[PDB]
Coordinates of C-alpha atoms and ligand atoms in Angstrom, one line a residue:
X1 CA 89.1 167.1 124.3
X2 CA 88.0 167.3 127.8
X3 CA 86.5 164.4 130.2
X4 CA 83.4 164.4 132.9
X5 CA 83.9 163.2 135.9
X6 CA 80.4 162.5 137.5
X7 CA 80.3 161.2 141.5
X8 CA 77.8 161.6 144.1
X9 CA 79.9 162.7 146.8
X10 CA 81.2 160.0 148.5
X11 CA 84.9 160.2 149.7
X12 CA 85.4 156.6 148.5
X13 CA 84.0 157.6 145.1
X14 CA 84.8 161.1 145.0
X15 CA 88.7 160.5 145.5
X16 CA 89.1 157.2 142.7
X17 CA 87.7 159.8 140.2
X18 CA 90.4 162.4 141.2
X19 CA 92.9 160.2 140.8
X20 CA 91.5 159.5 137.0
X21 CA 90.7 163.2 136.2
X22 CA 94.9 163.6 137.1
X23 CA 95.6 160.9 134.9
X24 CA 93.5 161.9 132.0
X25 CA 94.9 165.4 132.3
X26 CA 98.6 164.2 132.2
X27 CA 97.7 162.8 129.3
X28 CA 96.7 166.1 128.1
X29 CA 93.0 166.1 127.7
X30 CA 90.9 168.5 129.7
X31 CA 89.0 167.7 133.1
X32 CA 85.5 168.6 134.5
X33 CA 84.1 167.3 138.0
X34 CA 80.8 167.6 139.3
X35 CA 80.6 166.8 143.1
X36 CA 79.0 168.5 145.6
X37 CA 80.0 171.6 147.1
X38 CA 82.2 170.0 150.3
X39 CA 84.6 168.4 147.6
X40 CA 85.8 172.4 146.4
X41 CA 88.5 172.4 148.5
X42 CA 90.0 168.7 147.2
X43 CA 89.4 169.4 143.5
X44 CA 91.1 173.2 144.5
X45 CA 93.9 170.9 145.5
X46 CA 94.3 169.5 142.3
X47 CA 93.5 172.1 140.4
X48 CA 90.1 170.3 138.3
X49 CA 87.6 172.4 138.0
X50 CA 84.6 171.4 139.4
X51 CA 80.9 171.9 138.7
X52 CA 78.8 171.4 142.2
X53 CA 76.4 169.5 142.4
X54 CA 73.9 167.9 144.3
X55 CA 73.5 167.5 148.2
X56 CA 67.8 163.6 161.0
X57 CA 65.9 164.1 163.7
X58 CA 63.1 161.7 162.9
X59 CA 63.5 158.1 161.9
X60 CA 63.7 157.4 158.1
X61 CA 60.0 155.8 156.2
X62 CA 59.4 154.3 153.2
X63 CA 58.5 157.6 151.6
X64 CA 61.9 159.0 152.5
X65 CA 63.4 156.3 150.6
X66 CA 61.7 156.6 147.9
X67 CA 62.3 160.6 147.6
X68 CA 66.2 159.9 147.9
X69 CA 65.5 158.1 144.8
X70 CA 63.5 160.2 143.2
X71 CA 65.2 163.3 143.7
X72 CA 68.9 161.4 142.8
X73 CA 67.5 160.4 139.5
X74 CA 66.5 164.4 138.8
X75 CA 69.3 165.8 140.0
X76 CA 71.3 164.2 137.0
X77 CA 68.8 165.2 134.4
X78 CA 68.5 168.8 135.7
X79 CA 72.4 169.3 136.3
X80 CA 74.7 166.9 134.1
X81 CA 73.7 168.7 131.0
X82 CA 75.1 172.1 131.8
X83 CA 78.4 170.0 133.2
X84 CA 78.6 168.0 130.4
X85 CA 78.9 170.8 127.6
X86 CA 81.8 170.8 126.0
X87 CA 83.1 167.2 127.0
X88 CA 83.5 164.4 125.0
X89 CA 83.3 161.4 127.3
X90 CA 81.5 161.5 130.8
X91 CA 82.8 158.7 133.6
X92 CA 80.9 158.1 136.9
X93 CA 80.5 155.2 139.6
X94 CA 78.5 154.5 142.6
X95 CA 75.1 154.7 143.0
X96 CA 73.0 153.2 140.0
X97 CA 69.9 155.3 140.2
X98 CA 72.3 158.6 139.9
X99 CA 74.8 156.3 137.1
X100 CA 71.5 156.0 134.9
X101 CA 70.4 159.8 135.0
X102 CA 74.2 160.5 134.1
X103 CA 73.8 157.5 130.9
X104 CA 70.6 159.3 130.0
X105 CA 72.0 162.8 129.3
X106 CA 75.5 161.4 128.0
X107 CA 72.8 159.7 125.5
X108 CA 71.2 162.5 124.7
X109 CA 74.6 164.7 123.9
X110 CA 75.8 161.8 121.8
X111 CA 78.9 161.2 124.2
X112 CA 80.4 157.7 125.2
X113 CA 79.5 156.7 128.7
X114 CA 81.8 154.7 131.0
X115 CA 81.3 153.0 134.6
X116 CA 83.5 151.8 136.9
X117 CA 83.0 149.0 139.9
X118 CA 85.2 149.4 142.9
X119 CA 84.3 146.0 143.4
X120 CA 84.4 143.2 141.2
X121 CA 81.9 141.0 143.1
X122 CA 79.1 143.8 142.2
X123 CA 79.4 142.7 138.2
X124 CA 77.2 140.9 136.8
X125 CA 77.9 137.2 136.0
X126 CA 76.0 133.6 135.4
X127 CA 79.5 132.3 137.2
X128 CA 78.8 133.3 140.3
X129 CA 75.6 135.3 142.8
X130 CA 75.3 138.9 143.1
X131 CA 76.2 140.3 146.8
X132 CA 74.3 138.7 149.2
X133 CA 69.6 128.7 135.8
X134 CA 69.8 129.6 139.4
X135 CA 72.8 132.2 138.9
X136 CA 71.5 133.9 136.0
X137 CA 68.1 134.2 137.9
X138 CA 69.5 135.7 141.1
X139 CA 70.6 138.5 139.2
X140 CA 67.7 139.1 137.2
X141 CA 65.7 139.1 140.5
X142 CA 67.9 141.7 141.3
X143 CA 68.1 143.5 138.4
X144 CA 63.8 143.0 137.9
X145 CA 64.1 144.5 142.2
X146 CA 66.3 147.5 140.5
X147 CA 63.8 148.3 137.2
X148 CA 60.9 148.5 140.1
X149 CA 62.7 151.0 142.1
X150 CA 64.0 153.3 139.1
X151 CA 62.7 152.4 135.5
X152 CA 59.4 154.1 136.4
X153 CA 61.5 157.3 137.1
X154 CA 63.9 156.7 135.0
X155 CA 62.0 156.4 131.7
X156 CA 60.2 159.4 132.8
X157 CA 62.6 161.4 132.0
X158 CA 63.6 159.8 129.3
X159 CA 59.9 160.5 127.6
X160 CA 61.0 164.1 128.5
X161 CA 63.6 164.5 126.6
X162 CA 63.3 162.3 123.6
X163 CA 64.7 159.3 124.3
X164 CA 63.6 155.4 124.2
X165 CA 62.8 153.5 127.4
X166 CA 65.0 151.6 129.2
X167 CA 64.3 147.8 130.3
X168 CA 67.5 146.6 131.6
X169 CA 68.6 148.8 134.1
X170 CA 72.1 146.7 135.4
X171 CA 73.3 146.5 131.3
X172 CA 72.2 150.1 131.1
X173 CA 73.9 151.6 134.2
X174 CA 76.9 149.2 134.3
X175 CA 77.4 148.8 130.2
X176 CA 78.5 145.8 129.2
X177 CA 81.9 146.8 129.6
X178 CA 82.3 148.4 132.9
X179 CA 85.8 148.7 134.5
X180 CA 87.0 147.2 137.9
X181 CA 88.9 149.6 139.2
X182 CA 90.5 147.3 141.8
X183 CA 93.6 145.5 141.9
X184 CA 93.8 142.3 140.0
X185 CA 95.8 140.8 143.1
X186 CA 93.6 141.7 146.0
X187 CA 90.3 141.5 144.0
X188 CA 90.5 139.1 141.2
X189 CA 88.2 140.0 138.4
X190 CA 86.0 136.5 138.2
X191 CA 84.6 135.0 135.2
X192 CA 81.9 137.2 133.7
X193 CA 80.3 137.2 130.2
X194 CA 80.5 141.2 130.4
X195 CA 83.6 142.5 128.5
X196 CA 84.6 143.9 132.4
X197 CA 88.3 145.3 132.0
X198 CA 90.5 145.3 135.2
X199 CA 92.7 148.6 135.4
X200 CA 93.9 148.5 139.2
X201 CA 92.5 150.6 141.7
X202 CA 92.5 155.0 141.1
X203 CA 94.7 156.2 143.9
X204 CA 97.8 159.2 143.9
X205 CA 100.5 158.9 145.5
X206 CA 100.4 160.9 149.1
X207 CA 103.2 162.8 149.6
X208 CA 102.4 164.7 152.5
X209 CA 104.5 163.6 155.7
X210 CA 103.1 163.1 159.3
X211 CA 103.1 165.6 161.7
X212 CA 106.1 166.4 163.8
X213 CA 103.7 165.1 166.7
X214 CA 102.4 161.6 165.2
X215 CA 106.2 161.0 164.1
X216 CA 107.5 161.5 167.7
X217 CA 104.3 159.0 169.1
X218 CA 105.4 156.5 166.3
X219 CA 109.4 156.8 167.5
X220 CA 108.5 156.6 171.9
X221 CA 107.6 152.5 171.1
X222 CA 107.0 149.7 169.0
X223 CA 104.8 150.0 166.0
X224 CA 101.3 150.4 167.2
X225 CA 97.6 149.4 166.0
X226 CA 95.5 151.4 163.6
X227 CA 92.2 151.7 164.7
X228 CA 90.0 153.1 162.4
X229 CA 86.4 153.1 162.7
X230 CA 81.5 155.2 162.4
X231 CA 80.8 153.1 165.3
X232 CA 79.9 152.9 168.8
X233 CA 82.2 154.1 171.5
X234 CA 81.8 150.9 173.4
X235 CA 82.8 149.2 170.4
X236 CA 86.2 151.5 170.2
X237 CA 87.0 150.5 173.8
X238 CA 86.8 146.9 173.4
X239 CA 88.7 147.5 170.5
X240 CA 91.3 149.4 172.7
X241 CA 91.2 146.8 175.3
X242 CA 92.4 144.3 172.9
X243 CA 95.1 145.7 171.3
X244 CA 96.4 146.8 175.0
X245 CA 96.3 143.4 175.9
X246 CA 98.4 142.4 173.1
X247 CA 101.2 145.0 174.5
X248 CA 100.8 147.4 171.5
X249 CA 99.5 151.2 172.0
X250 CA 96.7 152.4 169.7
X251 CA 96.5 154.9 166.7
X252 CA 92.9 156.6 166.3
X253 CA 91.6 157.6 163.4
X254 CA 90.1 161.1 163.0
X255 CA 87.4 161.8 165.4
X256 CA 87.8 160.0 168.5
X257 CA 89.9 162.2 170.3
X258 CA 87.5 163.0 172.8
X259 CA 87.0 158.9 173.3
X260 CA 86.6 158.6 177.2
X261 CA 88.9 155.1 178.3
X262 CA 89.2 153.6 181.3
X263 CA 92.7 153.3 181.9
X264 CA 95.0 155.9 180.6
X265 CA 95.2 156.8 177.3
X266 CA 98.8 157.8 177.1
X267 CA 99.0 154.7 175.0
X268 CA 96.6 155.7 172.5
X269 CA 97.3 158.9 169.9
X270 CA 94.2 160.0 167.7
X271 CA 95.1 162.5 164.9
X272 CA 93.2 164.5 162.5
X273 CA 94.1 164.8 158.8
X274 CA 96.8 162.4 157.7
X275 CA 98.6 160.7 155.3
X276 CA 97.5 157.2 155.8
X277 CA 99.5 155.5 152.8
X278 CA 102.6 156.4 155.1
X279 CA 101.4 156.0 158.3
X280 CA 100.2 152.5 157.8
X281 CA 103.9 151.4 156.5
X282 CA 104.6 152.1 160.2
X283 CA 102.0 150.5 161.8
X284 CA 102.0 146.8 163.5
X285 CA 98.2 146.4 162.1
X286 CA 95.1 148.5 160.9
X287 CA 91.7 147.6 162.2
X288 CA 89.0 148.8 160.1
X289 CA 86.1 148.3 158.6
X290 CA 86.9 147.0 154.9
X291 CA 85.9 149.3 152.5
X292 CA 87.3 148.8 148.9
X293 CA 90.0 152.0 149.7
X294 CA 91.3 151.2 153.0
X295 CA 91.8 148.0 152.0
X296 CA 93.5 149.0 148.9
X297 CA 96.2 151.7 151.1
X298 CA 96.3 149.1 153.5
X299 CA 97.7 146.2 151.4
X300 CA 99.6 148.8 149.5
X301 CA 102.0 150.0 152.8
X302 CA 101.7 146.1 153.4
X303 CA 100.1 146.2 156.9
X304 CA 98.4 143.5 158.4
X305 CA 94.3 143.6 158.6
X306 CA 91.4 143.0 160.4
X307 CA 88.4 144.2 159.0
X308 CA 85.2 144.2 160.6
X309 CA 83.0 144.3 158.0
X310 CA 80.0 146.2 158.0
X311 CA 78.1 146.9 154.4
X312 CA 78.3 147.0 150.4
X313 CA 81.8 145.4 149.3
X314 CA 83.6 145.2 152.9
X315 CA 82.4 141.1 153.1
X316 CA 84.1 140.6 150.4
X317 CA 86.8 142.9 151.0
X318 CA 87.4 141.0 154.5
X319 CA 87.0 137.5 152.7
X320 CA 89.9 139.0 150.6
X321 CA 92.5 139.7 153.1
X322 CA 92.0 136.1 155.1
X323 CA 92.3 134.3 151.3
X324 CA 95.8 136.1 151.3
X325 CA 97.1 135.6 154.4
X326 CA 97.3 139.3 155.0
X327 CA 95.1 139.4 157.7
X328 CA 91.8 138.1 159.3
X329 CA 88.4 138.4 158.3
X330 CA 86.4 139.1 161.8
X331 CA 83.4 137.4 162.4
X332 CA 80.9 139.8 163.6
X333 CA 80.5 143.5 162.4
X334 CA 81.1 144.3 166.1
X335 CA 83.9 143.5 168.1
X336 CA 84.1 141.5 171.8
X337 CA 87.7 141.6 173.7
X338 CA 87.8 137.7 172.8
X339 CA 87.0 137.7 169.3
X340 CA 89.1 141.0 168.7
X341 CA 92.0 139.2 170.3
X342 CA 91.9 136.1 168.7
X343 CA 92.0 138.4 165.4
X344 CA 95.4 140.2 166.8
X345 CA 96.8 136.8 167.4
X346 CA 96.9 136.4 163.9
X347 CA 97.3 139.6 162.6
X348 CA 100.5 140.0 164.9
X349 CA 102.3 137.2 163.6
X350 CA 105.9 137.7 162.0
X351 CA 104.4 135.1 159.2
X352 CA 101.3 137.5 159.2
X353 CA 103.3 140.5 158.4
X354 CA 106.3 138.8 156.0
X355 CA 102.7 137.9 154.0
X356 CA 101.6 141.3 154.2
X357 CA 104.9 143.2 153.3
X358 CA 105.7 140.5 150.2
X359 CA 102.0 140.4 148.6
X360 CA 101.9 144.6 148.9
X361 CA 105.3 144.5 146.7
X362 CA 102.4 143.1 144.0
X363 CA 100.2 145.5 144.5
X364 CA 99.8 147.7 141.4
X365 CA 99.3 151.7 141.6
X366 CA 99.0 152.4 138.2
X367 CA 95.4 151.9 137.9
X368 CA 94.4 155.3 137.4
X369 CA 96.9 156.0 134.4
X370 CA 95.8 152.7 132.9
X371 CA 91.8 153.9 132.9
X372 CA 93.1 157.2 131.6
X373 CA 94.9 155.6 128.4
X374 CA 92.0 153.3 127.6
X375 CA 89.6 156.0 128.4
X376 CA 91.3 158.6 125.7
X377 CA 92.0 155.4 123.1
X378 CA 88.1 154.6 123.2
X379 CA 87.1 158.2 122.8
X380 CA 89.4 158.3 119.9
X381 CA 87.2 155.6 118.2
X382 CA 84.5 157.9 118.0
Ligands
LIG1 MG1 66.8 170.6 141.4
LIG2 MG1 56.4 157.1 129.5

């Protein structure tokens, strides 16, 4: 029996789905990924075979939107089918107008289909409003918004290869019984007519150490801030400024190491590739900008947060880590020395990291191997 793994490139999707093509194949099922070309050298890592697929100077127009679209939805219909022979099941998350395309040809093979959220807030729900009687109609609106954008498309090629039109696209692309793949302690599934099915959130274990270099950095003083944002360089100083103020040195994430700063940067060490899930253990803080992974590693090595918040799932994300006491939820997506400051305040606390350190004990890092077993016990059922 072998498994699809479908993603659209994205490290924060393309990594979750590693982690459950690992966990399927311990099980002992087979494993297929189709990603595009730049994730050969992870999925060599791993040893999943992988099936690539799929992907300026002038501002974008409404025309370039709508070709992203256009040419997302094809790319499924034109590619998934050769991935897809010989699999049983086909998993995918992320972008809807690529998920329906992948639904479409599962369809058309006869295969169960399966989508996960990496965020709860995004499912559906009369108990509470989609990412921003009444309830119910905000996500319809959304839902009617999504249907104008990709059910013309969609059912296009549909017509082309046999199959009936679709009129719901969130029921269609989600299912009715999507997974969350997030933990149940950071991000609470909420009440939800949908059979939604919390598993944890898909991460392996790191096992790689730090360099010789960042160890020696982390041993010469006290446990410094994690900075990692993209974002303006002005934005990074502030940032610097703060955490300087607050007597700690900095930590930057990959590709500021050319970062021009006003008074020396002895104090601050930017590395390359590195293990973050053991790095942040030894951190006093991580700055960042909440996205659903991140926050996940984070809480995990039971740092202390601020997240800046930005797009997608990181409001909610950030609104997660002040609820817990793990951290603070910063106002604006940009940083001032002031507000940033008044965030370390917080963040620095001996209560702020006793929080941080108990609640990650309750973290769980199963999630993967939990989506795995229900994955193979459903396709057994067909
Ligand atoms: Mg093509
Ligand atoms: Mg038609």
């Amino acid at each position: 029996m072998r498994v699809l793994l479908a993603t659209c490139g994205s490290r924060g999707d393309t990594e979750p789905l590693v982690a459950l093509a690992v966990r399927v194949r311990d099980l002992g099922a087979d494993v297929r990924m189709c990603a595009p070309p730049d994730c050969a050298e992870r999925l060599a890592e791993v040893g999943v075979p992988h099936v690539p697929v799929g992907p300026r100077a002038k501002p974008l127009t409404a025309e370039d939107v709508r070709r992203f679209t256009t040419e997302a939805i094809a790319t499924q219909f034109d590619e998934i089918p050769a991935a897809a022979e010989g699999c049983a099941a086909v998993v995918t998350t992320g972008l809807l107008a690529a998920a329906i395309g992948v639904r479409s040809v599962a369809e058309k093979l006869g295969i169960p289909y399966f989508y996960a959220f990496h965020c709860p807030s995004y499912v559906p729900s009369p108990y509470y409003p989609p990412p921003p009687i009444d309830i119910p109609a905000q996500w319809e609106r959304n839902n009617q918004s999504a249907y104008q954008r990709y059910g013309g498309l969609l059912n296009s090629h549909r017509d082309a290869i046999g199959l009936p039109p679709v009129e719901d696209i969130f029921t269609f692309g989600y299912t009715d019984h999507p997974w969350v793949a997030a933990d149940p302690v950071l991000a609470p599934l909420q009440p939800t007519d949908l059979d939604a099915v919390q598993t944890g959130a898909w991460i392996l274990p790191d096992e790689r150490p730090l360099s010789p270099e960042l160890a020696a950095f982390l041993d010469a003083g006290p446990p410094p801030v994690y900075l990692g944002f993209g974002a303006p360089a002005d934005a990074v100083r502030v940032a610097i400024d703060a955490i300087r103020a607050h007597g700690r040195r900095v930590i930057l994430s990959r590709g500021w190491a050319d970062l021009v700063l006003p008074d020396d940067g002895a104090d601050c060490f930017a590395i390359g590739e590195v293990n973050h899930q053991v790095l942040f253990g030894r951190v006093a803080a991580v700055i960042h900008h909440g996205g659903a992974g991140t926050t996940h590693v984070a809480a995990r090595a039971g740092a202390p947060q601020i997240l800046l918040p930005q797009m997608a799932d990181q409001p909610y994300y950030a609104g997660r880590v002040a609820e817990l006491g793990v951290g603070v939820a910063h106002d604006g997506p940009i940083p001032t020395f002031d507000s940033l400051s008044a965030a370390l305040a917080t963040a620095l606390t001996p209560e702020t990291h006793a929080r941080a350190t108990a609640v990650a004990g309750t973290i769980r890092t199963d999630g993967a191997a939990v989506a795995a077993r229900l994955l193979l016990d459903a396709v057994s059922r067909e």
